[PDB]
Amino acid sequence: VKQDMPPVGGYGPIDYKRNLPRRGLSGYSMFAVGIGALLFGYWSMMRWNRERRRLQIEDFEARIALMP
Amino acid sequence: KNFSLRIDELEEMLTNNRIWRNRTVDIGVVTAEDALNYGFSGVMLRGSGIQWDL
């Protein structure tokens, strides 16, 4: 009998092809994401700065009334 | 099977890179006159012009 190493009935298929997911996000919408986060931060920043100006004028009134 | 997947992940890593492409595009011009007179062999001849394979 003969006992070499053949392919056992023909092997299954072998992949070789390239693949890229191209993800993605449709980058103009990603610019919209960035500009939205930017303007979100500016809105909250504006609110906090004006409330802190209010409190800083209160500390001004403290130093004014305490002074004489 | 394993190696086809790993080399496609190497294409995922390196080929679509910004600064690696910027690192090797500008250099290494090879004119076909130079490729055939200066005795170049193999991958230079494939990568620069002439259709050639032993």
Q: Which residues contact B30 (CB under 8 A, 6 or more apart)?
A: B40, B44, B47, B48, B49
B4, A15: Cβ pair inside 8 Å? yes
Nearest to A16 by CA among B9, B5, B16, B11: B5
Q: Does A3 touch chain B (CB under 8 A)?
A: no
B8 interfaces chain A, CB cutoff of 8 Å: yes
8 Å CB contact of A20 and B1: no
Query: How was this entry determined?
Result: cryo-EM
Distance CA B10, CA B4 (A): 10
**CA A50: distance to chain centroid?**
28
What is the spatial distance between Cα A51 and Cα B2, in angstroms, rounded to a whole number? 61
A vs B: CB pairs below 8 A: 12
Closest Cβ–Cβ partner in B1, B8, B11 for A14: B1
Point out the residue among B1, B11, B12 whose CB comes nearest to the CB of A15: B1
Nearest CA to B12 out of A15, A21, A17 is that of A21
Residues just before a chain gap in chain A (C–N exceeding 2.5 Å) are none
* Integer Cα distance of B21 and B26 in angstroms: 9
Resolution in units of Å: 4.2
In the numeric block, which tokens belong to residue A44? 């909250």
Residue linked to tokens 């076909």: B32
Q: Is A15 within 8 Å of B11 when comparing Cβ atoms?
A: no
Buried b (16+ CB within 10 A) or exposed e, A6-27: eeeeeeeeeeeeeeeeeeeeee
Task: Pull the structure tokens for residue B27.
Answer: 């250099």
Q: How far is CA B52 from CA A5, A14, A44, B31, in A?
A: 35, 27, 65, 15
Would the CB atoms of A14 and B4 count as touching at under 8 Å?
A: yes
Integer CA distances (angstroms), A55 to A50, A51, A59, A62, B12, in order: 9, 7, 6, 11, 54
Alpha helices, DSSP H, located in B1-54: 2-10, 18-23, 32-37, 43-47
